[PDB]
Write a protein that binds this ligand. Structure first.
Ligand SMILES: COc1cc(-c2ccc(O)cc2)cc2cnc(N)nc12
Length: 292
């Protein structure tokens, strides 16, 4: 009953984001028309083709299956009559994306706080891995802020389920891809694994410690290293050669050595040498303990 939401009772309040092949809106589920209803986050498809609806239903089943303090909560689904368009209903995290939150407050969020968020992201990712899910799009823009003390992973739109007999998922015909967060084997062979999510986690750690300084973003820095003259497919070709030759994002200004060492270990060309999320959460919590 409460996981079944009638669309006619969903009142549009504001736009929240436009990520993959859809959009997220803040709505009030108000079946009493007195504006006393619950505020929820609603994901819908901008282009709801057969293929997109099929992938969106898998995203919904993925989100529904996850129950963790650092993963956005699934609330329900709204079904349309006839062609069966879908809306994913989720909890609304009022402080918005971690990217926007950090870009707004900057260094007013101290290192202790950044490491609390880092630990929460590792814990959400470690739990995701126990379900054999590969996020593929871990970035601060896809992490949401519930309050000053808690962040949660969102946007499971690129998430893949590992085959039963394989430790990677190969994407045959990729769509829009966040190449500046991709592990080298994801760029070269379109192979995604827990280890490529660890590589992305290293990029998220870099984002946090740059405080989202625009000129320091992973796309701005990698484009600077390959040359700003590179365009389209040439960007991927030169990025692969850069990573193969140990070109990496620089240490963020004022980043503690112990944190930078974690980033560089996540960015290992050798897939098997990257740390596990279980170990990362242990390591980050010890650093937090030493700082406290
Ligand atoms: C883009 O902003 C958001 C995205 C999601 C979300 C989560 C899981 C998922 O598979 C797809 C989308 C949820 C959101 C919740 N509260 C706010 N502020 N924003 C949100």
């Amino acid at each position: 009953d409460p996981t079944q939401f009638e669309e006619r009772h969903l009142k549009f309040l504001q736009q929240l984001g436009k990520g993959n092949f859809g959009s997220v809106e803040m709505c009030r589920y108000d079946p009493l028309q007195d504006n006393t209803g619950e505020v929820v986050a609603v994901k819908k498809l901008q282009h709801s083709t057969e293929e997109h609806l099929r992938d969106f239903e898998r995203e919904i089943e993925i989100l529904k299956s996850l129950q963790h303090d650092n993963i956005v909560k699934y609330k329900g689904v709204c079904y349309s009559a006839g062609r069966r368009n879908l809306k994913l209903i989720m909890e609304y995290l009022p402080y918005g994306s971690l990217r926007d939150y950090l870009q707004k407050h900057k260094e007013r969020i101290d290192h202790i706080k950044l490491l609390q968020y880092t630990s929460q992201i590792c814990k959400g990712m470690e739990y995701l891995g126990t379900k054999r899910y590969i996020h593929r799009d871990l970035a601060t823009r896809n992490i949401l802020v519930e309050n000053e003390n808690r962040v949660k992973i969102g946007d499971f739109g690129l998430t893949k389920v590992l085959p039963q007999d394989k430790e990677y998922y190969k994407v045959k015909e990729p769509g829009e891809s966040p190449i500046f967060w991709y592990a080298p084997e994801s760029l070269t062979e379109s192979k995604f694994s827990v280890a490529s999510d660890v590589w992305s986690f290293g990029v998220v750690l870099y984002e946090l410690f740059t405080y989202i300084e625009k000129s320091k973003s992973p796309p701005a820095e990698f484009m600077r290293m390959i040359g700003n003259d590179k365009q389209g497919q040439s960007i991927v070709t030169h990025l692969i050669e850069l990573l193969k030759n140990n070109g990496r994002l620089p240490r963020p200004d004022g980043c503690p050595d112990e944190i930078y060492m974690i980033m560089t270990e996540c960015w290992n060309n050798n897939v098997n040498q990257r740390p596990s999320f279980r170990d990362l959460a242990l390591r980050v919590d010890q650093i937090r303990d030493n700082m406290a």
